[PDB]
């Protein structure tokens, strides 16, 4: 009746480094990207990862100090040591940075920037703007503002490149 803890099935535990330990110069960062409980990268070695948190943008490189970031709807960039850039777009979630050389970005929804379309965003933005005036109450206005902000961020990311 010793209920096996669900985490025990997952043997890929997090590698945390002790404070007093000697330093190691790392050349790659182990990135773990997850969408709706589905990982796209499994401890992939990358040169750097750019993530847009609440306060601002962050460029995470190997050896970055341990930190927790609350992401916002925005693009995410991954640059490999080879010299290849891969861009996704996330709607939210958290990013955990470890001083040991790991970065786990678990987002509610992470989709390729290519999969998104421009005209679809434009029409949706117009509809939300029209519906904002006809908002039932304050809560509806805030919800529409959230939707508008997400669409604007998507459009800005597409127009950037």
């Amino acid at each position: 009746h010793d209920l096996p803890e669900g985490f025990e099935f997952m043997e890929h535990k997090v590698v945390n480094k002790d404070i007093h330990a000697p330093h190691e110069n790392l050349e790659t960062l182990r990135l773990t990207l997850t969408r709706q409980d589905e990982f796209l990268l499994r401890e992939e070695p990358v040169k750097c990862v750019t993530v847009t948190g609440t306060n601002g943008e962050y460029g995470i490189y190997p050896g970055h100090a341990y930190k927790i970031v609350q992401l916002n709807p925005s693009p995410l960039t991954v640059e490999y040591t080879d010299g290849t850039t891969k861009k996704y777009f996330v709607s939210g979630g958290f990013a955990h940075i470890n001083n040991e050389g790991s970065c786990d970005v678990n987002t509610v929804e992470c989709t390729l920037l290519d999969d998104l379309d421009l005209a679809i965003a434009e029409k949706e933005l117009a509809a939300q703007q029209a519906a904002l005036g006809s908002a039932k109450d304050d809560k509806a206005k805030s919800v529409v503002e959230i939707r508008i902000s997400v669409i604007e961020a998507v459009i800005a990311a597409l127009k950037h490149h």
Partner: protein, 254 residues
């Protein structure tokens, strides 16, 4: 002759039963083949959710010590004929009967059982239409309902089914210490040398604001559910393809 007539009717009737069930196996075979993709695409989503609510602990002190409501959210299918997955969950709940225990089950066939076997420990249950791949919004709704059931709840225990191999299905548990006491334990992980794996992770959360921590707690707690409900489905299709072959070797014997 009537006796011969009876037996002939019985044989073909059983044949019609073998046909309607052979189709079920083909159906649940598809819902399992397609659902086998999760095994390759799992076990890395919750890595840091471990450092949050992975507290190796005894099964007695955690129960007796608490004096507030203990919420339980067992996961059950809304349709019968899936091995003993739904059955074993009830047995686990019965073994953890307590004054503070409360049940908020998932599924039509979980509601059917817990409603009557634990009348004094029932508030309400959730149900999921299986036309959608288990999504985050479904997990959030469960979490929000659990909080409203007992906001001052000592813990929330989710009991679901895990799918190791094609036939090895087990019962798994996720414990979600209530934020108020999680903050207190994060304190020990930041100051005392005790809890070294959770020293860095604990400190980084402390450096950030409280709202981010609260969002972090809700996010990964919800993400844990997205694995609980999402995984039970895979076990469901496994048992429903292991007791639909057992029902076809008994029809063929009759």
């Amino acid at each position: 002759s009537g006796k011969l007539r009876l037996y002939k009717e019985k044989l073909e009737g059983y044949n019609r039963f073998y046909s309607i069930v052979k189709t079920i196996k083909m159906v649940t075979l598809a819902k399992y083949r397609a659902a086998q993709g999760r095994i390759r695409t799992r076990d890395f989503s919750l890595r840091y959710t471990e450092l949050a609510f992975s507290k190796p602990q005894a099964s007695r002190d955690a129960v007796v010590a608490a004096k507030n409501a203990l919420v339980y959210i067992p996961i059950t299918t809304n349709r019968g004929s899936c091995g003993a997955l739904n059955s074993n969950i009830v047995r686990c709940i019965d073994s953890v009967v307590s004054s503070k225990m409360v049940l908020m089950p998932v599924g039509k066939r979980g509601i059917d059982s817990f409603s009557k076997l634990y009348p004094d420990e029932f508030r309400y249950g959730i149900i999921n239409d299986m036309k959608e791949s288990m999504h985050f919004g479904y997990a959030t709704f469960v979490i929000e309902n659990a909080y409203e059931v007992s906001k001052d709840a000592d813990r929330y225990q989710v009991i679901f089914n895990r799918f190791v191999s094609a036939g090895v299905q087990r019962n798994a548990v996720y414990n979600i210490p209530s934020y108020e006491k999680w903050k207190e334990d994060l304190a020990d992980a930041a100051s005392s040398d005790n809890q070294k794996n959770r020293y860095l992770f604990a400190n980084a959360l402390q450096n950030e604001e409280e709202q981010l921590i609260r969002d972090f707690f809700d996010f990964h707690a919800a993400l844990a559910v997205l694995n609980a409900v999402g995984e039970n489905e895979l076990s469901e299709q496994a048992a429903r393809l292991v007791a639909v072959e057992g029902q076809l070797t008994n029809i063929s014997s009759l």
